Design a binder for this molecule. Structure first.
Ligand SMILES: [Mg+2]
Ligand SMILES: [Mg+2]
Ligand SMILES: [Mg+2]
Ligand SMILES: [Mg+2]
Ligand SMILES: [Mg+2]
Ligand SMILES: [Mg+2]
Ligand SMILES: [Mg+2]
Ligand SMILES: [Mg+2]
Ligand SMILES: [Mg+2]
Lengths: 150, 51, 117
RNA sequence: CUUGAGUCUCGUAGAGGGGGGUAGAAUUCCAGGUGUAGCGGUGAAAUGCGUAGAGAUCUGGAGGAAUACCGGUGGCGAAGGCGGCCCCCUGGACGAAGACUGACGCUCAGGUGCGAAAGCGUGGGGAGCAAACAGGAUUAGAUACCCUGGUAGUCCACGCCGUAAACGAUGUCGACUUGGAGGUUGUGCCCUUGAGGCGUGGCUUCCGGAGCUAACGCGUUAAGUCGACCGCCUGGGGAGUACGGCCGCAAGGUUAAAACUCAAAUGAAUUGACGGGGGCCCGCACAAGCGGUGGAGCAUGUGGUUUAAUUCGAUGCAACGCGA
């Protein structure tokens, strides 16, 4: 409610050691079976070699670029009815949010297996594909697209 | 209300005339009139202006 | 294809809607805009940032001439008395004089009772 | 006789009244130019208006109503009420040197007259607004609130009706009784050297002392202390009704009961509860997410239904894997 502290410092990736990738595995994690999450994403994250052939590291961030929004809505119980006054999105959630769309939509892909069903999505991310990239504009069509209230 | 300035710029000067008429004596009309509602509320809002 | 060069621009700023017409010097229609005609309708218009996109549409119909300068006629209150003039200042047009031509009587006609909820 | 009351003089302020003019802003409408697919409206919408060209815009014209700013806690009036500028006829209030009359005064049943708005009659007028009425919407319904229209009416003359929370809910006249701040208007005075400063009258706001008051509150403009005259009240309902009279064109007004019925009706103030009142707060209350229930098969309980019995209980959050 009124509580005001700090964020929960997360433990970096099991290898590259990166908070950005840390909360990534967590957002992807399920049933506290964190192990699988690693062995499911950490693989597809490197399986990019077969998909490219080099130091697959920045590919992740570059892939998220096509999935990084900067405007969202927010209904407000004002003016009798309910406003929508859209507002941008700070970095703290930008990177986070995206990760959800990248995973929460990579599951309904319906491919070989979550391990790979995820990999492909990354390539589709930077190359614009799947609901992951969709959600962006499908969301932007509200904010910045309806500044009439913003 | 009459604006006019040299050196093209969209400064303003406009809200200067916005202190004598403007959206005020406008909304004043807008809806119905007043009659007894004013002479009263005009003499009660006056009480407010005391402290 | 007349090339009026310069002509005042009326900004009928209202509540339920706003419309700006870039008429000529004498007062002839050269190009008018409209919020209702600016995609969004219903009531989503009104808002200033919604009228600006309307009047700006004139620079697409009244641009056939070559208005190098123009005045502004703001009439009636509502979200479109400022927005309009602004969008016009960016559209590339000039300016010669801003003025409010809102009909402010002297207690003439008796306004409608209306509203009572 | 002169201090009450009044007359005269000379000034002052005023939306006091009656008549006649006149000005500017805006609305609507008529005509024409430009220009083009929307306008208008609402919470949304829809009716409605638009390609027979609206809306917008500009030019010219017609007409009616009301007078932004000044405008105020302001002013004038017996009350009701009275706002643009100009003229004509007219009433009252106040101050000051004074001069004059000489108690000629106060109140006032009955009586006469004036009375918001709505309404009525005859004849005018009619822009805007708007009972009625008609559409559209809302809703369970919506003979409403909202929206699009709109007739009487609102305006004028002349006559009628006399009511209002016609309220300060506080009759008129007079004399007394601590104070403070302010408004408006007259007058005397002060290096009048000033915006100005000191008094002395009229009217008027707000606070408040004594006192008064059931309390709220009133408090030199009293609801305080007194005096003169008048109107009025005597529990609530029935009822400002019936009947009769009087008045009215008619609405209806005025005067004004009983039967029967209840044990109260009522006034202010206190405590709290509540408010689709306000201010400030906290709770996984919401918002942010993670996973569910609602569908599915099975378990369990319950209401049903059934049964000879389906033992009793638990039933809004606090009942149902509860007493078991
Ligand atoms: Mg109506
Ligand atoms: Mg008086
Ligand atoms: Mg009348
Ligand atoms: Mg009549
Ligand atoms: Mg007092
Ligand atoms: Mg009470
Ligand atoms: Mg907690
Ligand atoms: Mg939630
Ligand atoms: Mg969910």
């Amino acid at each position: 409610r009124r509580r005001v502290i700090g964020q929960r410092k997360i433990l970096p990736d099991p290898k590259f050691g990166s908070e950005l990738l840390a909360k990534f595995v967590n957002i992807l994690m399920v049933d506290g079976k964190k192990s699988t999450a690693e062995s499911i994403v950490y693989s597809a994250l490197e399986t990019l070699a077969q998909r490219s052939g080099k130091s697959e590291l920045e590919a992740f961030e570059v892939a998220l670029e096509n999935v990084r929004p900067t405007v969202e809505v927010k209904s407000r119980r004002v003016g009798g009815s309910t406003y929508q006054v859209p507002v941008e999105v700070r970095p703290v959630r930008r990177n986070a949010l995206a990760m959800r769309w990248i995973v929460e939509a990579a599951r309904k892909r319906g491919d070989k297996s979550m391990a790979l069903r995820l990999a492909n999505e990354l390539s589709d991310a930077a190359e614009n594909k799947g609901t992951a990239v969709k959600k962006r504009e499908d969301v932007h069509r509200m904010a910045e697209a309806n500044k009439a209230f913003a | 209300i009459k604006v006019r300035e040299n050196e093209p710029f969209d400064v303003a000067l406009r809200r200067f005339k916005r202190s004598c008429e403007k959206a005020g004596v406008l909304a004043e009309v807008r809806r119905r009139e007043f009659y007894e509602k004013p002479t009263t509320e005009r003499k009660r809002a006056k009480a407010s202006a005391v402290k | 294809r007349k090339q009026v060069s310069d002509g005042v621009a009326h900004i009928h700023a209202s509540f339920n809607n706003t419309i700006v017409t870039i008429t000529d010097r004498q007062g002839n229609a050269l190009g008018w805009a409209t919020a209702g005609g600016s995609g969004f309708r219903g009531s989503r218009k009104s808002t200033p940032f919604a009228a600006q996109v309307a009047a700006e549409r004139c620079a697409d119909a009244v641009k056939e001439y070559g208005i190098k300068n123009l005045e502004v006629m703001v009439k009636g209150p509502g979200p479109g008395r400022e927005s309009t003039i602004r969008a016009l200042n960016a559209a590339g047009f000039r300016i010669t004089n801003i003025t409010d031509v809102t009909p402010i009587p002297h207690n003439g006609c008796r306004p409608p009772k209306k509203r009572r909820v």
